[PDB]
Amino acid sequence: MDYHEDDKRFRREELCREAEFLKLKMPTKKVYHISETRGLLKTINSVLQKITDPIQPKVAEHRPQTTKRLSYPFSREKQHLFDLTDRDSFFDSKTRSTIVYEILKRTTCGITSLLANGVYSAAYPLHDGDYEGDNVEFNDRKLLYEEWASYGVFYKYQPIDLVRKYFGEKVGLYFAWLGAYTQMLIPASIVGVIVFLYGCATVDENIPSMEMCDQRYNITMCPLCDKTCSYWKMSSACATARASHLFDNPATVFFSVFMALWAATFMEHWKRKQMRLNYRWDLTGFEEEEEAVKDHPRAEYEARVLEKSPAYFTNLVSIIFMIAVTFAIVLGVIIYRISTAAALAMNSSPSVRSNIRVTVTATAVIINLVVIILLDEVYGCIARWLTKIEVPKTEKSFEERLTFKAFLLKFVNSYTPIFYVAFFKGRFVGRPGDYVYIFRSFRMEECAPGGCLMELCIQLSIIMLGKQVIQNNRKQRYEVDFNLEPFAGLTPEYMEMIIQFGFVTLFVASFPLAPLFALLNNIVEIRLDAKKFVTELRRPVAIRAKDIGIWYNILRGVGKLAVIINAFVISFTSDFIPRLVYLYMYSQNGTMHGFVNHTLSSFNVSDFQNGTAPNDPLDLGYEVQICRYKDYREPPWSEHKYDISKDFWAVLAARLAFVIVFQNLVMFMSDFVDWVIPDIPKDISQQIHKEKVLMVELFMR
Amino acid sequence: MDYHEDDKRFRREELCREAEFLKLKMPTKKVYHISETRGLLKTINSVLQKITDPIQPKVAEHRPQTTKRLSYPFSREKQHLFDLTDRDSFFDSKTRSTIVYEILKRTTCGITSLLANGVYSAAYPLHDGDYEGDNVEFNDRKLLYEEWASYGVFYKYQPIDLVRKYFGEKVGLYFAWLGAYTQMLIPASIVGVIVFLYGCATVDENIPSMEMCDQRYNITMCPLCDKTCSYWKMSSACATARASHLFDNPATVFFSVFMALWAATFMEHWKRKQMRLNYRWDLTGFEEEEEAVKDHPRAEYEARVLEKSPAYFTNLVSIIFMIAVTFAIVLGVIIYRISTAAALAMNSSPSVRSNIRVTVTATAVIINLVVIILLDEVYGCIARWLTKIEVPKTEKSFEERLTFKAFLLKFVNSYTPIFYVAFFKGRFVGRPGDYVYIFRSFRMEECAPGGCLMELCIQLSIIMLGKQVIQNNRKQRYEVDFNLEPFAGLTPEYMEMIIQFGFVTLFVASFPLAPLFALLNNIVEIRLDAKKFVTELRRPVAIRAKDIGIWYNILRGVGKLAVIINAFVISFTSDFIPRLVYLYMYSQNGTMHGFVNHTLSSFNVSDFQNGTAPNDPLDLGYEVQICRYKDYREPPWSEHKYDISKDFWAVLAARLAFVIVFQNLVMFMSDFVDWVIPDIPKDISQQIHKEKVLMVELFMR
Ligand SMILES: [Ca+2]
Ligand SMILES: [Ca+2]
Ligand SMILES: [Ca+2]
Ligand SMILES: [Ca+2]
């Protein structure tokens, strides 16, 4: 049981002599202000860095950090830059660790240069006591384990003041943002359940659904593949049409508008909440610019350029990153294209005879998700290498550029198959008179029969649930925390949340119960992150932060892109605009009767291109003469046959007009939601006004 | 010649006794810190308010206001909140007037309550000396008259430090913004002249222009009016087609993109320039919130609601303002509709026989501009009355709400005829088989023959030049400034500049030399505003300001609306998308030959509706059987005649797709221009860093 002390570093004790000299030179600089104690356990030494009482005001004044006062107006104690009070244990462990880390970073041979050189293996603070220990005494770690880091306390609120008090305000800000996201997902999940129940309660009487599942019509569709498969009855796929209505009803369009407004309201609710937490924790912006130490490779680079005496190199690095992003996009496209074929071969190998084209698609999206998880680490390493060779000036810019590059790579390799299936999947394929052949021998495949909106939503389901699947399916203190996993950072924990937010905002024009899945994921992910921070990972160094930072701009950009993505999803891949066009232009009775016969276009089977027709035309029991495809083209009994008709141009014009109306009106409503809701709450403003006039009154006398 | 003194107020000296008692009560409160001297000239007294030396540090410390320091690092003197230096005339006239006005506003019976009550006619400062006076001694007013307020010094730069030193920093900020606007209009004007010369150098060989001005084709167009006029040859209007190419060439589309980027660049340049001027003048944000005195009607309202013991009343006021704005819109539409008819009757009264339909349109837009100038004051008074009955809490919110209401009313009544001619002018009229009749007897008019883009640009020309036309076509001091016109405010001077900016950004997709007209207007308007501020108007009270305020948000909103307005102008009223559609879909040779025959649609003259055909079908010398209109409809020799064909839907789909592409790409490029250009300049940041570390170093010792 070590005494009350602070951040400790780990040495390498058995060139080696130069490393030992560098390991001993800095403690000689630490003699004046840091106490030390060495320890041997079996073969490797370690050192301790307890700091003394008079040096806490020495560093707490040069770096301005807040301190609670004595007076309590309205039973709420005020704060000040420094207050001197006896029984000096009021400096909690996070403040002491921050002061010691600032001492380590300021004193040169910074501690990061010695850690990257290799003379120091690690430098971590120690957790206060132990969690779930026998006969422990009022531990903050134990309190956070029993009240916050438990699966049986998931419904209760989280002690955000306690997690700020223990793991600092960056981890506190992350958990407050995650709690705000989880709390805002509840009304979206409720409305999503309502919309899904509306879809389930209407699909029985949905007129296209009954027209497409009806027998005695005997409509024979076009083969949709090469000479391997053949003509298929449309009714044989209309069970997909029963699943199709649950995702493209007008309630889903209202749901898209509601989630645009919900993303806006969440953005300014978090904008107010971060100012509320800034009022609660620290409003001092005295941490001024150009105070962090520069990078040692940056120092070497500037020494080199002053000896040999930039923007061009940084522009070249950004260009290389741009072709890297384009390569990632085309790589994701080709990975999805080969993964669906690999799943098709795997399912056709033992002749399972599913005859549903859903289990094979689930296998395809599962192996695609596996490959995406495999290349996520590759893209992270590529982004880190690209950012390190640019050698930014400070650590903050280094972290922000690494964050930007990693987020763009995660965005492209996590949304490339979904953007491929949603938009560029079965539109560029031509008429059955003549198809388009990529590499002059392979046809570009059409999507799922009866509508690949079902394919899009099951890919969304599997990819969103895969993140849940991969997570759900005599000794002294210093060696115990040495056995613990080191703390990496909040950046990969923000990455998955931002990707989930992209799923929630970008693709609920096709999946109304995505907020429900996101809420069910976040409910257990809050407790998993709590258990990981309390039990497994080492104590974070509690770096000071004011707001979230770059991820707020990332959320704003995702929300702005979600408007145009949702508009394009509703217009093009949702098959809702053609229903409106048939209802208001071609109905002739005011009802949606004959919509399926209007959408389908005839094709004479004598006009295939060089044996593309199937080898078995008698599989249906009759010799079919005309198949029906879906492209809005002229019938074969016309003067200009297999040509684009007026209906295609009318439907396309209506789709583009709806994109214009949706995008403009939804951006205007989001701007109105931004304008109405103030950034600063009125109560926080009157409280900070009262606090500043009360401190002026107190310091007047 | 009065001595060195400050702001003086004007009394009413011959109930009257109560007014006299209120006029004498407040000078008794002025005895302690203000000196006074009374003066009679013929019948009315006046008072003087020279302030004493010890009161200047008393008020200059409670309200933190700038004071130059003695030391000059890099030949630039620093700034501190207060410095004590002998020869106390370093406090210039604007600071003394501001201190005296703050004294007047703080001391109760505020000075605005006594001025609105009626006991005080005016309260104005005196100009330092006189301009252009004989044997004057280094006057700032004289220096600004010969160096800034003159028409012979228009090419030189303006002394922005001197105008800040004399009329304060609000007038300085207005003149700096006007100078930045004039300087940024120069490259836009150069590119506009280049684009206009490109249009002039191509119109000779423009294939639609030669096809439309060619003889021997003998195309007879539809009557385009009621039974009054008759069929007209298209060539008889193709001189308008020679003017039409100068405004809808592809250089104009590139010009629209260039002005979107130019508006973004101007916004970021002014954003940097206002921070530069903030560094030069004052960076202190110590003027905290809730320090201004509340309104007396607001005090009466809160006293009433506390005695009798809001959001509903404010919402009702905003609703009344919304129906007021809608009424202004429909009023502007009907004013244009009756003004064109009034001009037509006025021109047809003496039988001028112009036969050009341009002089009558110029008369229509001139009288429309006259009516708009007439109702601008009406809308300003309506906005002031609507804002005053809402009784806002402070003066700043009162001015901002009055500004918002006045700007919306100015926007609607200044852009309603232009938005009417651009978009809703000749599109809702039907085919010549059957027209639409408003009020069941009057046809909705078609616009000018050969293209009403010419009508739109001549209306833009006249409305933009009308603001230039209405502007170009033994005694002591206190009585001299009493004879001068009182200072109203910078709000009406900002209104015309914002309307000019709306003209520059919203409508250069149809008028490429609008920045040239704006530059030629601003060149003389800077000098007229300078002469008005120096010679005619009284001295402003020099209220402190940091940025412009609401007008920056207004400029941002105008620039954001300009993207979609320009996209709709290029797609719908520019006739550029149909040229692209004919070139890439119907050309059959790759050239623009037969475009006029493709756009025009035939109509049999046997199919007019109830005598709508003209009374004189033999005016052209032949009995015409088929006229040609412009609606993309099926020919009469068709199974479905006079019906919308495939070409209309294709052209409409291309127009909407171009609106989508233009809006999305142009907003992305504007966001990229905002993102690349930093808000704070790097040199200003390094200088404020150097200044703060040097003041820390000085105050350390
Ligand atoms: Ca996590
Ligand atoms: Ca807001
Ligand atoms: Ca003016
Ligand atoms: Ca910027």
Author numbering:
A (entry chain B), B (entry chain A): 117 to 130, 165 to 259, 267 to 466, 488 to 651, 683 to 910
Q: Mind quoting what the paper says about this structure?
A:
A similar mechanism underlying channel activation also applies to the ion channel TMEM16A, which opens in response to an increase in the intracellular Ca2+ concentration (Caputo et al, 2008; Schroeder et al, 2008; Yang et al, 2008). TMEM16A mediates important physiological processes such as epithelial chloride transport and smooth muscle contraction and has been proposed to be a therapeutic target for diseases including asthma, hypertension, stroke, and cystic fibrosis (Huang et al, 2012; Danahay et al, 2020; Al‐Hosni et al, 2022; Galietta, 2022). The protein is a homodimer, with each subunit containing an ion conduction pore and a principal Ca2+‐binding site that are closely apposed (Dang et al, 2017; Paulino et al, 2017a, 2017b). Both pores act independently and are activated by the binding of two Ca2+ ions to the principal site (Jeng et al, 2016; Lim et al, 2016).
In addition to this ionic interaction, our previous study has identified several residues around the Ca2+‐binding site as important determinants of channel activation, which is manifested by a profound decrease in the potency of Ca2+ upon mutation to alanine (Lam et al, 2021). Here, we focus on Leu 647 on α6 and Ile 733 on α8, both within the π‐helical region, which are brought into van der Waals contact in the Ca2+‐bound state upon α6 activation. To understand the rearrangements underlying the efficacy of pore opening, we determined a cryo‐EM structure of L647V/I733V, whose gating properties are similarly affected compared to the less conservative mutant L647A/I733A but which is characterized by a more severely perturbed ion conduction pathway, in the presence of a saturating Ca2+ concentration. With an overall resolution of 3.29 Å, the final map shows well‐defined density for the entire protein, including the bound agonist Ca2+ in its principal binding site. Single‐particle analysis of L647V/I733V reveals a major conformation that is distinct from the wild‐type channel. In this structure, the disruption of the L647/I733 interaction results in an incomplete rearrangement of α6, with the helix adopting an intermediate, partially activated conformation. The described change in conformation is accompanied by a loss of the density corresponding to the Ca2+‐binding part of α6, indicating that the helix has become more mobile and that the interaction with bound Ca2+ is substantially weakened. The single‐bound Ca2+ is in a position similar to the lower ion in the doubly bound state and is coordinated by two acidic residues, Glu 705 on α7 and Asp 738 on α8, with no coordinating residues from α6 since its rearrangement is impaired.
